[PDB]
Every structure is written in C-alpha cells, then in structure tokens.
C-alpha cells in the first residue's frame, strides 16, 4: 500500500488570506500512460465528501477559481487564493494510480474571525420529562468566537460539576462562530427541593460572567 | 469506458 | 442521485447488505466504489465494481470480507459485509467518481446491545425570558442507540437560526440537542415543530413546542 502523508494537521487562517495544504506520496504517482491519478476532496462534517480537483490540476465543475491543484511525482499541493467562511472543513489527497487507492490523513481548516460574545439561553425541564422521573436543565450558548469558553452551573448558590454534558458545534460556515449546549441532568426529587438554578458563562470578551437563571416557583 | 477519473480496471 | 440504505444495529458475527440506488442516471456507465469512514479516521477505499458486467476489485484488507454485486435492473449496487465485528462499526459511502456522485452515507453499528428509541422533549423558555425581538427555543432528544438521529424544524422549513449539537454518549446511550432562534412575532402565533427520525428503529417523532403554563 502506498502511503499518502499530508501537512499541516490543522490550519488557521484569517478570512481572505491564502492557504496551502501539502501532500507527499511514498511513491511516484505518474502512471506509465502519462497520467497522474491524484485528487483532492473536501468534507464539511456529517456530509458526503465532494471532489474539488482531480488528475492533480483539473478542477471539477462548480468549484471556484481559487482552488488550485499543483504538484508532480511525489509532491502535490492544494492552494486556496482567498479563504472564505464556506471553506471550513477537512481536505484529503487521494491517489488512484496504485492499487489499492489510499487517502491521506486529511487537513482541517479553521477560520480566524473577530471576537464575539455568546447569546445565552436557559431552559427548565419539560413537564413531559418531569413525569418520567428525571429533570434536564439545558443552557444554550450561541454564536461566539473564539472556541474556548467555560460554564458553571449553580443551584441555589452552590456550584455543581456533575450530571453536566457539553457539546460544541463545528465552526459555522456562514459567520465562523460557535455554539455549545450544556445540560444538567438530575432526578426530579433533587430538582423539586431546589428553587434557584443558574448558568454562568465566562468568555474572553469579558472578565465578568454571563449569568442566566430561573426561579422554579414563579414562571 | 471511461467510467472513472482514476486508473481503470485491469 | 444516490440514495443509500439506513443505519443498522446488527450484532457481532452477523452479515449485512447495503444498497445504493441511482436515479438521475444509469449505473452501468460508472464504476461504483465504496469508501469506509470510521468517524475518527479518514476515508478508507473499500473496492469498486463495474456494474455493466459485474466486474470488481477489492482492497487486500477487504478480500473475503466484502462482496460487491449490482442490479442494472433497479439501478442498484450492493456491498455485502460478512463476519462483522467492532472494526466495521463505521459510515460507508457509495460513490460514482466519474462525475462525482455521492450518497448521504449509511451508518453501521456492530453491537450486541439492542436498539432504543429516543425520547423527544420540547424546550420552551421560562416565563417569557425576552432577549430583544427574538425567541430561542430548543428540542432535547435523549436516550437512544445507535447513531444516528435526524432532526429538522418544520420538515426543514426552518432553514436558518438553527444549531444542532453533536450527540454525546453517556452510560451506553446517546443524547442530542438543537436550538432555533426566530423573530418574536412568528412563535407562538405560527407553530413550531422539531422532527426527530431515528432510522435505526424506524421512528419518526414530531414535537410541537407550545408555550408553557402552570409549571
């Protein structure tokens, strides 16, 4: 099997800057017939892959002029003139000259964008889930940048750190921001004893914390 | 064929 | 273009047959190749078949573990995997590279454990918490096996102001969430619903997010 190795592993770019992805094969990809069977594919997460360039430099229909395929023999390069919001995802170099076809490890591309503060939203457990024995208090932290952030859950003043389940979404392809969900799963008995529930979020955009809460009593 | 953009079947 | 079968919780030791069906075109003129993607690693080429004469080739790692066949009649290609184990729990795609046709993917979980359907809970906001002229609502889909789940707002009508968070596994059961921010005017006037389809257990669930009252 022929090894395809690409660099870098990740790549940050300010919307507008160029970018380059390199790929190196353990063997030449020039077939005896004069053809180099190498391609570059893109994949934005949880979607079917898409081919950008094939045969090293030919571009597929409906692929912007800014995607250039270069290289020969064992070294090939993928170049993006100006990087845009929609370019976020993973890129791979794929060889089909030797059998079996092998794909490189892929390269994830991220975008450096201006900083943003998350718009917070807290949610009390649906009664529908209450009458089943449990209680999920969810908090949504949306459209913010950079990725790094943290969330504390405070019940009646005291901080809790278990039951918590967090999820981050990939960098949005429209505004390059993020979002994150944080839910605190507890029993209904535990839930009904306590009144005040809080969701504290601290983000680079401010040292002072974004505080969203609700008092299970008046609603 | 042509049925692919990669190397054809032998 | 290319429709593929749904997710399948099949048990260890078993076999499985995946179908890929072409519509807009005729699969004779193309080579149908299948690629594996263990959603951690990259793509792994499995093999390919020339449906016109059912002529195929398989990667060394798949000889004897994969079988490719085609049905020129119903415009369908198959990839039958045998002796499934934990190494096969992946997402397989069928593809016709010539003109770049892909199928949405078929998730496959090899596990002994049984299928569980998710419980969908609407998330409507506390006492009119009003952040401006917008309203943010959610849908908590939890307790299901296996992946994936397919969530949409109003069968897809709500194509913006949506955030569908990756599912996190916990105690051998997944959990997922989604949000939707809209203008203060629409909801509650115009109703909102999140459809959750757990194809692994032929389950479709629509939840009308209604304004809470005495609770």
Report the alpha-carbon distance of residue A172 to residue A86 in Å, rounded: 8
Phi, psi values for residue A129, rounded to 5°: -90, -25
Whether residues A96 and A27 share a domain: the answer is yes
Cβ proximity of C88 and C110 under 8 Å: yes
Cα of first residue to Cα of last residue in chain C, in angstroms, is 48
Contact between chains at A35 and B5 (C-beta distance less than 8 A)? no
Of B5, B6, B9, the CB nearest to C50: B9
Q: Which CATH number fits domain C113-211: 2.60.40.10, 1.10.8.10, 3.10.50.40, 3.30.9.10?
A: 2.60.40.10
Cis geometry, peptide bond prior to residue A153 (ω within 30 degrees of 0) = no
User: What CATH number does the domain located at C1-112 have?
Assistant: 2.60.40.10
Residue partners of C164: CB distance under 8 A and separation at least 6: A169, C151, C176, C177, C178
One domain for residues A75 and A146: no
Closest CA to A171 of A105, A117, A112, A83: A112
**Experimental approach taken:** X-ray
Whether A142 and C163 lie within 8 Å, measured CB to CB = yes
Beta pairing class for A10-14 and A107-112? parallel
**Resolution for this experimental structure (Å):** 2.9
Q: Say if CB C48 and CB C28 are below 8 A apart.
A: no
Please report, in angstroms and rounded to a whole number, the separation of the first and last CA atoms in chain A: 64
How close B8 comes to chain A (CA, Å)? 9
- The structural domain count of chain A equals 2
- Give the Cα separation of C71 and C59 in Å (integer): 22
Residues 123-152, chain A: which have Cβ within 8 Å of C?
A: 123-130, 132, 136, 138, 140, 142
Interface with B, mutate which of C77, C98, C100, C101 (most B CBs under 10 A) = C98
CA distances from A63 to A151, C30, C51 (A): 40, 22, 29
Q: Are B4 and C29 a contacting pair at CB < 8 A?
A: no
Single out the residue in A61, A94, A113 at which a domain terminates: A113
Q: Say whether both A39 and A119 belong to one domain.
A: no
Token code pair at residue C118? 């998710």
**Residue A32 and residue A13 share a domain:** yes
Residues A150 and A218 in one domain: yes
Last residue within a domain, chosen from A98, A113, A128? A113
Tokens representing residue C19 in the block: 């179908």
Whether C10 and C17 have beta carbons less than 8 Å apart is answered as no
Nearest Cα of chain B lies from the Cα of C94 at a distance, in angstroms, of 14
Domain limits for position A136:
114-219
Q: Which residues of A touch C102 (CB under 8 A)?
A: 48-50
Residues A130 and A68 in one domain: no
Q: How many C-beta neighbours within 10 Å does residue C109 have?
A: 22
Cβ distance of A48 and C125 shorter than 8 Å:
no
- Boundary of a domain, candidates A113, A135, A163: A113
Residues pairing with A38 in the sheet: A95
Burial of C165: CB neighbours in 10 Å, binned 0-12, 13-18, 19+:
buried
Do both A69 and A150 map to the same domain? no
Domain spans of chain C, in order of start = 1-112, 113-211
Dihedral angle sign, alpha carbons of residues A128, A132, A136, A137? positive
């Amino acid at each position: 099997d022929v090894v395809m190795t690409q660099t870098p592993l990740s790549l940050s770019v300010t919307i507008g800057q160029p970018a380059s992805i390199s790929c190196k094969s353990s063997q030449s990809l020039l077939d005896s017939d004069g053809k180099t069977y190498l391609i570059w594919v893109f994949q934005r997460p949880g979607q079917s892959p898409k081919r950008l360039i094939f045969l090293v430099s030919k571009r597929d229909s409906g692929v912007p002029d800014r995607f250039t395929g270069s290289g020969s023999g064992t070294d090939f390069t993928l170049k993006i003139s100006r990087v845009e919001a929609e370019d976020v995802g993973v890129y791979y170099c794929w060889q089909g000259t030797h059998f079996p076809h092998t794909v490189g490890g892929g390269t994830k591309l991220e975008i450096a964008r201006a900083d943003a503060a998350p718009t917070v939203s807290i949610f009390p457990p649906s009664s529908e889930q209450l009458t089943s024995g449990g209680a999920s208090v969810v908090c949504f932290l949306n459209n913010f940048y950079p990725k790094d952030i943290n969330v504390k859950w405070k019940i009646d003043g005291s901080e809790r750190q278990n039951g918590v389940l967090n999820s981050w979404t990939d960098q949005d392809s429209k505004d390059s921001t993020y979002s994150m969900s944080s839910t605190l799963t507890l029993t209904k008995d535990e839930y009904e004893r306590h009144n005040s529930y809080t969701c504290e979020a601290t983000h680079k955009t401010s040292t002072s914390p974004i505080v969203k809460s609700f008092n299970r009593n008046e609603c | 064929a042509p049925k692919t953009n990669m190397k054809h079947m032998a | 273009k290319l429709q593929q079968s749904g997710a399948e919780l099949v048990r260890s030791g078993a076999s499985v047959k995946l179908s890929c069906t072409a519509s807009g075109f005729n699969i004779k003129d193309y080579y149908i190749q299948w690629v594996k993607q263990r959603p951690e690693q990259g793509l792994e080429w499995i093999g390919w078949i020339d449906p016109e004469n059912g002529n195929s080739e398989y990667a060394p790692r798949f000889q004897g573990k994969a079988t490719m066949t085609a049905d020129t009649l119903s415009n369908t290609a198959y990839l039958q995997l045998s002796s499934l184990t934990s190494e096969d729990t992946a997402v397989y795609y069928c593809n016709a590279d010539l003109h770049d046709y892909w199928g949405q993917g078929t998730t496959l979980t090899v596990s002994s454990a049984k299928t569980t359907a998710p419980s969908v809970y609407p998330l409507a906001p506390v006492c009119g918490d009003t952040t401006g002229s917008s309203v943010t609502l959610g849908c908590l889909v939890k307790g299901y096996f296996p992946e994936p789940v397919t969530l949409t707002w109003n069968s897809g009508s709500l194509s913006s102001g949506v955030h569908t968070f990756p599912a996190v596994l916990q105690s051998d059961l997944y959990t997922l969430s989604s949000s939707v921010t809209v203008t203060s005017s629409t909801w509650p006037s115009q109703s909102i619903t999140c459809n959750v389809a757990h194809p692994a257990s032929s389950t479709k669930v629509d939840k009308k997010i209604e304004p809470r009252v005495t609770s």
